Amino acid sequence: GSGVGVSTGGWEGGTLFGDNRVITVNTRQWYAPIYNGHRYTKLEGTGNTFWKGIKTPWGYFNFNAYDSHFSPQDWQRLTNEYRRWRPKKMMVKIYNLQIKQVVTLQGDTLYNNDLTAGVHIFCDGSHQYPYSQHPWDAGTMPELPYKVWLLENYGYFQFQGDLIDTSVDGGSPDVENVEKEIAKSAPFYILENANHEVLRTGEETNFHFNFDCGWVNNDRAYCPLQADFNPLVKTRRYFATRNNYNNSGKFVYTRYSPYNKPSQWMPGPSLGYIGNTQSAATREQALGPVTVVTAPPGTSAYTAFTEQQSKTNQQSASNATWSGYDVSPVNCARSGFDKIGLAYDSAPESELEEKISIRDIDNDMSRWGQVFVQDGTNKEISNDNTGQGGNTRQNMAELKNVWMFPNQAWDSTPISRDFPIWVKSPNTDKHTLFDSSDGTLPMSHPPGTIFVKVAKIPIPTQTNTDSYLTLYVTGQVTCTIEWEVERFMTKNWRPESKNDVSSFRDAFLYTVGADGTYNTPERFLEGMPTRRGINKTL
Amino acid sequence: GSGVGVSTGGWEGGTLFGDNRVITVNTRQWYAPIYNGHRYTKLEGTGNTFWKGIKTPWGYFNFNAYDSHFSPQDWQRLTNEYRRWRPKKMMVKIYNLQIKQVVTLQGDTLYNNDLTAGVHIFCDGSHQYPYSQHPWDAGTMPELPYKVWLLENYGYFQFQGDLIDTSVDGGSPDVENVEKEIAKSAPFYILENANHEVLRTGEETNFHFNFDCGWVNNDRAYCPLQADFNPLVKTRRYFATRNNYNNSGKFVYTRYSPYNKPSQWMPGPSLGYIGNTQSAATREQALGPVTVVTAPPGTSAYTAFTEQQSKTNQQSASNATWSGYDVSPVNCARSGFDKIGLAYDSAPESELEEKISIRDIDNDMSRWGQVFVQDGTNKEISNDNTGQGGNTRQNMAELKNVWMFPNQAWDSTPISRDFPIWVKSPNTDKHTLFDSSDGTLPMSHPPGTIFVKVAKIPIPTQTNTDSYLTLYVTGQVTCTIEWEVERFMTKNWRPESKNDVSSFRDAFLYTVGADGTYNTPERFLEGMPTRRGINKTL
Amino acid sequence: ENVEKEIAKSAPFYILENANHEVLRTGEETNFHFNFDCGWVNNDRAYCPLQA
Amino acid sequence: SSDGTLPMSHPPGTIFVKVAKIPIPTQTNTDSYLTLYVTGQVTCTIEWEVER
C-alpha cells in the first residue's frame, strides 16, 4: 500500500509517435546535495563585473532542452516525418525519494539511510520568484537516461554593482541620491515564504502544465521571397532612368525584364554587427553584437561623464562592456551571419575536448545573405542646365542594419537536436514580434520551476552556532511532454533531403566508447538540424 | 448525362499516406494502334533461337512496377517511414475513350474523329490465356504522369523450335515420334473466344482486384545470423581436436571462446555461378548462371547425342545455350554476388545513353558473403599406430553452392524504386519456398491482364482481299492501388540511415532538362533502395 | 559538404498531373467558389497632418 | 503594400488549364501530338463588401 518499503512509482520511458500527437516519456535518477550550507548569501562575481545577486540553498529541475526529451532517433524521426510541432502539456512526477545521511565514523565515509528526513519541493507556477533559468545552461536533464543528474544551485540577480556605487555611504539618508534608492528598492526573495510540500521516502508528488505557445517549423523555402514569379508573362511595370545628368533631366521609363520583377516583400530584420573579436582576455566583459548599459537617469555607471549636448551621464564604448550585457545572436532573418552568433558545446562537464558546434548549414531561401540599397545616379548632378555630369557619386551601398519594416517575411533559424525548447518572455508591458535568433519559443508563462532543497536537521551545539546534519536526497523524476505535431503533405515530385546519418563526418557517434564515454556531435549537421528537406511553397 | 459530348471521368492522381494504408492514384494518357494488322501470325525469332510463338492483334496494360505507382518522393517517404508494405486491392478505370481515324487525303495525313467505332477491352481474371507478361519489361506504366503511354503488343510462346524439328514431315502420321506430338499438342489461343466489352467514346469501364500476397520488408539486420550472443557468459560447448595424426588418435575437447560460439542457423541458399562472361557476340544465346534445356524424353534438341550410360539424349554445354533458357539472378541469400545478377536501365526507349544501374549496396547482415567448410585435420592420417602425420590434406574449402537446408534464415534482396512489384507464380503442382532474387512477390493469381484491340472496320474491295480501316484508340486509365503498410517502432538510440538525396552523386535528377529530357538515376543508390536504415533485432 | 550541390538536390520539381482535376468536354461545365478573408481598401483621405 | 495590394494568406486558388494530349501514331515512336486548342467562356462574379 504505502510506507518506507514500497516504491511510489516505476521507471517510465520511451516515445509514442502518432499522427497528431507525439508523447515522450523520460525518467532520470537525480540527487540534490546541501547547497551553500543552508544559507542565503550575497553572490558577487569575481573579476570585473557588476552583477550582484543572491545564492540560495535550493536547487531546481531544468527540463528545457530538446535532446533531453528526444533520443537521437526520436529526433531524427521527428524532424523527418513532421512539418511542425509544439508542446501541448507536460507532466512531471518526482518519486522514489531516498534521503541518505553522510557520516564519517573514521577516516572512511559511510552512507546510511536516515528515515524521517524530509525534502522540500516547490513548483512556482505563478513565477512569483525570480526566473533565473537561462536557455543555453549546462544544468538540463541529461540526454542519456542512465546518467545521474545533479540538480543546479539556484540563485538570482539582485542589484547592479555600479548602480549602487556612488555615494551610497550609510552615514545619513540621501533621498535625492538615486543610486542609494536603487539599492533600497532592490528585492530580496526567500523561498520559505511559499507554500510547498515536504516529502519523505514513502511520499511522492507530481505536477501538470498546459503550454500555450507558437510552433516550431521544420520546412524550408526553396525560393527567395522576391524570386517567385512567372517569366513567361511580361510585367506591366517600368523603371525610371535619369538621362542627361543635369537640372534639365527627367526620368525615362522602360519595362522590367520578365526575369527581373519587383517585389513587395522586404527582407526580414537583421543587425549587421558581428560582435567584438578583439582577442580580449576577459571572459566576463561583454563580447556581443549589442551590449546594453541599463542605467537610470540620475545614476553614474562605472566611469561615466556627462554628454554636454544632453547633459546626461554616458559612458565610453570601452567602459560600457564593464557595465553592460550583450545580446546574441542579433542576426535574426539574415542567414549569412548564422555562423556568427551561436556556438555551443553538447558535452557537459567534459574537460577532455571542447567539441564546439556552430550553426553553418541553412538552406532556407526565406533568409537573406545581403541587402543592397541604391539611391540614384552614379554621378552628381550639375547645377546648370546642359553640362556633363559632375563629381562622382556612390550609387549603391550595402545596408548592414535592417530594422523592422512593413511587408517583411522571413523564417526563424533552424534548430539542432540540442537547443533549448522555450525561453521566458519578460513581464514587461510592451513586446514586439517574437523571433528568437536562437530559435527558442518565448512564452509568457513557461513551465514553473521546480525547486528542491534538503530539510535542515540541526545539531545541538554548546556554542549555539549553526551546525546542520550532512545529508542529501536522491530520487527519480519522470518528465512526460505531449507534443502537437503536423505531418507534411506535398505535391513535390523530387526526393527531399532527410537528415540521413550518411552525411555525418564521424562514424561512431551517439554511442558509448571503450571507457563508457558517450560520443556526441561536434558539428551542427551531426546534431540533425531542422528545416532540411521539406519544401514549402512560398 | 451520357453521350458523345460528356466526359466519362476526370483526371485522378496523388497519394494518401496513412498509418495502416497508403493509396496511390495514378492516371495516364494511353493509345493503342492497330497491332500486326488485325491478324494472328506465327512469331519466329531471328538469329539462333528456337523460341516460336504467336503474335496477336492485341495490346495490354502492364501496371507492374513500383516507379509507375509511386513518385520519387512518394517512394522516399514510403521507404523511410514504413517497416513493410504489400498491396491490398487495385482498381483500374479506363475512360475518356477516343477513337480517331487516320486518312491520307493527299501527301498529308489528317486525323479526324470517327464516332461509332468500338474498342475491345478484355480483362482476363481467370488467366485462361497465356500470361506472357514478364517482370523487367519496358512496357509498364510511365513514371511521368504527363508522358503518353503506348500499349505493348501481346504475344505468347507456343512451341519449342528444336523440339518440333526432327522427322516432323507431314507425309504420314508418326504416333511414336514424340516431337511430332509436341507440335500437335501445342496450344493456340485466340482472344475472340472470350466474353469482353466493346466500348465507344461515351462508354467507360473499370476493374477491381484483391491481392493475396506476402510482404515487402524494408528493415535490415545489423547482425550476422551467427554473431548474436553474449560474450559475457561462457559457453557450455567444447570443440573436438585430433591429437596424434594416426590411428591411435582421438578427439580432445576444449571449450569455445566466449566470443566464438556455434550457431544453429545456416546461411540461406545460394548458387555460386556468376553466369557466362565469355565476350559472346550473340545476345539471344543463354548467358546466365543456370541455363535449363527442357526436352521431353524421346525428343532430340538441337544437336544431341545419347549418353551411353543412361542411353538418353543429351547436349554439350555449348549447344545447350541454343536450346535453353537462363535464370538470373540465382544468388538468393548471398549478398556478395548482388552485383552479378541484376543490371537494368530505367530510361525507356532512350537511345541517348545506357544509364545501366546495378545493385551494389546491401547493408543487411542476414545475407552472407562467403561460406567455408572444413572437414578435418590438415594432414592425412597414417595407417600405422604411432607414426607422424602423412601426406598433406586440404583442411578447408569454400562452399560455392549452398542449397536449401534446415534452419536457414535470410532476407530477400533490397529493391529499388524501379523494380517490378509482383511476378506470376507458375500453375505447377509443386512449389518450394518463394524467394525471388529480383525481389518480386510471386502470386498465384496476380492482377488480370487487360487486353485492348481496336475494332476492325472493313473496307469493301473488288478483289475481296482483307482491307481494314486505319484507325487507333486513345484514352485515359486510372490505376488506384491500396497498400497495406506498417510503421516501424524501435528502441534503438542512434539515428538510422534514411535514403537522403545528399548521398546522390548527381545533383539534377528526377527533374526535366532544357529540352524536356527527364533525368533518371543511373545508379542503384540514386534509385532509393529498400532495407537502408531501419534496424531489425535478430 | 558542398552546400550548392545540396541546394540543387533539394530544389523541388512540381507536376500538375499529380493532382486530382476535372477533364471536361463540350457538354460539360464547371464552377468554383471562394470566400475572401482580407482587410479593407480605404477610399478616404486625411486633410490634416498627423501632428497638426 | 506600397503598391496598395491587399496581402492574403490564401488568395483565390489559381485555375489551371491545359488541352488534353491526343497522340499521333508514328513509326519512329517519337512523341507527336495532335494540334488543337480550347476556347470557352468564363464568368467571374465577385461580391464586394462596401461602406457608404
Measure in Å the smallest separation between the Cα of D39 and chain A Cα atoms.
20
Instruction: For helices B72-81 and A72-81, give the axis angle rounded to 10 degrees.
Output: 150
Chain A interface, mutation test: which of D3, D5, D10, most A Cβ atoms within 10 Å? Answer: D3
Tell me which residue of B289, B315, B295 sits closest to B304, measured CA to CA: B315
Residue type, B319: N
**CB-CB neighbors (< 8 A) of C19 in chain B:** 11, 13-14
Per DSSP, C16 falls in state G
* Breaks (C–N over 2.5 Å) after residues, chain C: none
Contact in structure between B12 and B25 (CB atoms under 8 Å):
yes
Residue A17 contacts B where some CB pair is shorter than 8 Å:
yes
Burial class for B374, CB neighbours closer than 10 Å (0-12, 13-18, 19+): exposed
Length of chain A counted residue by residue: 538
Determine the distance from the C-alpha atom of residue B19 to the mean position of all C-alpha atoms in its chain, rounded to a whole number.
Answer: 29
For the stretch B394-399, contacts whose Cβ atoms lie closer than 8 Å and that sit 24 or more positions apart, written own/partner, are B396/B372, B397/B372, B397/B373, B398/B370, B398/B371, B398/B372, B398/B373, B399/B272, B399/B371, B399/B372, B399/B373
SS3 content of chain A, % helix, strand, coil (to 5): 10, 30, 60
> What is the three-class DSSP state of A456?
coil
Contact in structure between B121 and B451 (CB atoms under 8 Å):
yes
- In angstroms, the CA A413 to CA C6 distance is 18
Contact in structure between B338 and B512 (CB atoms under 8 Å):
no
H-helix or E-strand containing A210? strand A205-210
- In angstroms, the CA A24 to CA A70 distance is 7
- In angstroms, the CA B157 to CA B167 distance is 22
Three cell numbers at B144? 511521368
Burial class for D37, CB neighbours closer than 10 Å (0-12, 13-18, 19+): exposed
> What is the three-class DSSP state of B475?
strand
Per DSSP, B151 falls in state P
Contact in structure between B372 and B308 (CB atoms under 8 Å):
no
Three cell numbers at A253? 521609363
Select from D6, D9, D13 the Cβ nearest to the Cβ of C34.
D13
> Which residues are within 8 A (CB) of A311 and not within 5 positions of it... i.e. 6 or more apart?
none
CB contact under 8 A, A494 and C7: no
Residue type, B520: T
Measure in Å the smallest separation between the Cα of C34 and chain B Cα atoms.
22
- In angstroms, the CA A417 to CA A216 distance is 12
Cα–Cα distance list, C28 to B313, C31, D36, D40, D46 (Å): 70, 11, 18, 11, 23
Chain C interface, mutation test: which of D5, D8, D44, most C Cβ atoms within 10 Å? Answer: D8
- Nearest chain D residue to A237 by CA distance is D3
Scanning B324-446, the segments in alpha helix (DSSP H) are 338-341
Contact in structure between A237 and A262 (CB atoms under 8 Å):
yes
Tell me which residue of A309, A230, A269, A250 sits closest to A432, measured CA to CA: A269
Output the CA torsion B14→B17→B18→B23 (10° steps): 50
- In angstroms, the CA A279 to CA A356 distance is 18
- In angstroms, the CA B467 to CA A400 distance is 81
CB contact under 8 A, B10 and C23: yes
Q: How are beta strands A148-150 and A21-32 bridged, if at all?
A: parallel
> Which residues are within 8 A (CB) of A340 and not within 5 positions of it... i.e. 6 or more apart?
A274, A275, A289, A329, A331
Per DSSP, D31 falls in state -
H-helix or E-strand containing A85? strand A82-103
Cα–Cα distance list, A56 to A188, A241, A453, B403, B457 (Å): 11, 68, 10, 74, 99
Tell me which residue of B69, B55, B65, B82 sits closest to B14, measured CA to CA: B69
Three cell numbers at B452? 485492348
Per DSSP, A247 falls in state T
Contact in structure between A390 and A414 (CB atoms under 8 Å):
no
Provide the β-strand partners of residue A357. A344
- In angstroms, the CA A74 to CA A86 distance is 15
Cis peptide before A406 (omega within 30 of 0): no
Q: How are beta strands A422-424 and A441-443 bridged, if at all?
A: parallel
- In angstroms, the CA D20 to CA A160 distance is 75
Select from A494, A510, A528 the Cβ nearest to the Cβ of B511.
A494
Across the B:D interface, residue pairs with CB atoms under 8 Å apart total 25
What residue has cell string 534509385?
B527
Question: At B349, phi and psi to the nearest 5?
Answer: 60, 25
Q: How are beta strands B312-314 and B305-307 bridged, if at all?
A: antiparallel
Provide the β-strand partners of residue C41. none
Buried b (16+ CB within 10 A) or exposed e, B253-292: eeeeeeeebeeeebbbbbbbbbbbeeeeeeeebbbbbebe
Burial class for D3, CB neighbours closer than 10 Å (0-12, 13-18, 19+): exposed
CB contact under 8 A, B146 and C21: no
Touching A (3+ Cβ pairs <8 A), the chains are B, C, D
- In angstroms, the CA A98 to CA A108 distance is 22
CB contact under 8 A, B31 and D23: yes
Length of chain C counted residue by residue: 52
Measure in Å the smallest separation between the Cα of B453 and chain D Cα atoms.
15
Half-sphere exposure of B306 (CA within 13 A, CB side): 8
> What is the three-class DSSP state of A80?
helix
- In angstroms, the CA A537 to CA A533 distance is 13
Tell me which residue of A94, A93, A87, A89 sits closest to A70, measured CA to CA: A87
H-helix or E-strand containing B319? helix B317-323
Contact in structure between A419 and A79 (CB atoms under 8 Å):
no
Burial class for B467, CB neighbours closer than 10 Å (0-12, 13-18, 19+): exposed
- Nearest chain A residue to B19 by CA distance is A19
- In angstroms, the CA A281 to CA A279 distance is 6
> Which residues are within 8 A (CB) of A368 and not within 5 positions of it... i.e. 6 or more apart?
A224, A225, A267, A268, A270, A333, A334, A335, A336, A410
Cis peptide before A145 (omega within 30 of 0): no
CB contact under 8 A, C3 and A497: no
Touching C (3+ Cβ pairs <8 A), the chains are A, B, D
Residue type, D31: D
Residue type, B50: F
What residue has cell string 500555450?
A212
First to last CA, chain D: 24
- In angstroms, the CA B386 to CA A87 distance is 81
Question: At A318, phi and psi to the nearest 5?
Answer: -75, -40
- In angstroms, the CA C26 to CA C17 distance is 21
Per DSSP, B501 falls in state G
Residue type, B300: S
Residue type, A488: F
Contact in structure between A492 and C11 (CB atoms under 8 Å):
no
Measure in Å the smallest separation between the Cα of D34 and chain B Cα atoms.
8
Residue type, A421: I
Cα–Cα distance list, A321 to A179, A340, B462 (Å): 20, 19, 109
Buried b (16+ CB within 10 A) or exposed e, B116-131: ebbbbbbbbeeeebbb
Three cell numbers at A497? 533531403
What residue has cell string 532512350?
B350
Contact in structure between A442 and A203 (CB atoms under 8 Å):
no
Residue D3 contacts A where some CB pair is shorter than 8 Å:
yes
- In angstroms, the CA A337 to CA A367 distance is 10
The DSSP result for B160-195, as a single string, is: ETTTS-TT--TTS--SS-HHHHHHHH-----GGGS-
- In angstroms, the CA B276 to CA B244 distance is 46
What residue has cell string 524530509?
A118
H-helix or E-strand containing A55? strand A51-61
Cα–Cα distance list, A185 to A182, A301, B195, B449 (Å): 5, 17, 98, 88
- Nearest chain B residue to A16 by CA distance is B489
The resolution in angstroms reads: 2.7
Residue D9 contacts C where some CB pair is shorter than 8 Å:
yes
Determine the distance from the C-alpha atom of residue A74 to the mean position of all C-alpha atoms in its chain, rounded to a whole number.
Answer: 22
- In angstroms, the CA A525 to CA A506 distance is 11
Q: How are beta strands B148-150 and B21-32 bridged, if at all?
A: parallel
Three cell numbers at A13? 520511458
CB contact under 8 A, C32 and D13: yes
Residue type, A516: G
- In angstroms, the CA A505 to CA A507 distance is 6
Tell me which residue of B208, B151, B160 sits closest to B181, measured CA to CA: B160
Per DSSP, C3 falls in state H
Three cell numbers at B296? 521431353
Residue type, A116: T
**CB-CB neighbors (< 8 A) of D9 in chain A:** none
Let me know the angle formed at the C-alpha of A81 by A75 and A87, rounded to the nearest 5 degrees: 60
Cα–Cα distance list, B476 to B8, B97, B447 (Å): 10, 7, 19
Cα–Cα distance list, B144 to B60, B141, B283 (Å): 19, 9, 30
CB contact under 8 A, B80 and A80: yes
Contact in structure between B518 and A523 (CB atoms under 8 Å):
no
Chain A interface, mutation test: which of B494, B506, B510, B512, most A Cβ atoms within 10 Å? Answer: B494
Tell me which residue of A135, A213, A215 sits closest to A445, measured CA to CA: A213
Contact in structure between B307 and B297 (CB atoms under 8 Å):
no
**CB-CB neighbors (< 8 A) of D39 in chain C:** none
Let me know the angle formed at the C-alpha of B226 by B223 and B231, rounded to the nearest 5 degrees: 85
Tell me which residue of B517, B514, B511, B516 sits closest to B353, measured CA to CA: B517
Cα–Cα distance list, B262 to A460, B235, B236 (Å): 67, 9, 11
What residue has cell string 552614379?
A378
Buried b (16+ CB within 10 A) or exposed e, B60-99: bbbbbbbbbbbbbbbbbbbbbbbbbbbbbebebbbbbbbb
**CB-CB neighbors (< 8 A) of A527 in chain B:** none
The DSSP result for A17-69, as a single string, is: E-SSEEEEEEEEEEEE---TTT--EEEE-SSS--EEEEEEEEEEEB---HHHH
Region for residue B332 given its phi and psi (left: phi exceeds 0; alpha: psi -120 to 50; beta: otherwise): left
CB contact under 8 A, D25 and B148: no
**CB-CB neighbors (< 8 A) of B80 in chain A:** 80-81, 498
Cα–Cα distance list, A217 to A304, A411, A536 (Å): 45, 9, 10
Provide the β-strand partners of residue B273. none
The DSSP result for B196-252, as a single string, is: -EEE-TT--EEEEEE-----EE--B--S-TT--S-TTSPPS-EEEEE-SSBTT--EE
Residue A14 contacts B where some CB pair is shorter than 8 Å:
yes
Contact in structure between B366 and B411 (CB atoms under 8 Å):
yes
- In angstroms, the CA B165 to CA B302 distance is 8
Contact in structure between B313 and B301 (CB atoms under 8 Å):
yes
Chain D interface, mutation test: which of C30, C32, C36, most D Cβ atoms within 10 Å? Answer: C36
